[PDB]
């Protein structure tokens, strides 16, 4: 029962400080809560992002600091989504950068 599962990542978000930033979308896109401030870490690429500003979005910020993330790049990973269609809907559209 690892963080490769969206369900497990979502449960790490206990005591999430940001009411305006969606923990569900963060967990859905690879993030788990580190429990240090508002810092989250991606289980697939390892990027850690914190000190979020109200203009920041889950996927764009993730893509901004980690352009080659396997999950965001739509490569094969061991991720287990709660809802596959919802994940496909939120991941960055395909494109060769």
């Amino acid at each position: 029962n690892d963080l490769n599962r969206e369900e497990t990542r979502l449960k790490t978000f206990t005591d999430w400080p940001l009411d305006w930033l969606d923990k569900r979308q963060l967990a859905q896109t690879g993030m788990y809560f580190t429990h240090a401030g508002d810092k989250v870490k991606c289980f697939f690429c390892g990027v850690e992002i914190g000190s979020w500003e109200q203009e920041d979005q889950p996927v764009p910020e993730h893509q901004r600091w980690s352009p080659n993330c396997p999950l965001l790049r739509r490569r094969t990973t061991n991720n287990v989504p709660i809802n596959a269609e919802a994940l496909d809907r939120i991941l960055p559209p395909i494109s060769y950068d």
Partner: peptide, 7 residues
């Protein structure tokens, strides 16, 4: 946001 760690 700030990246506390970049791959």
């Amino acid at each position: 946001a700030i990246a506390y760690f970049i791959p």
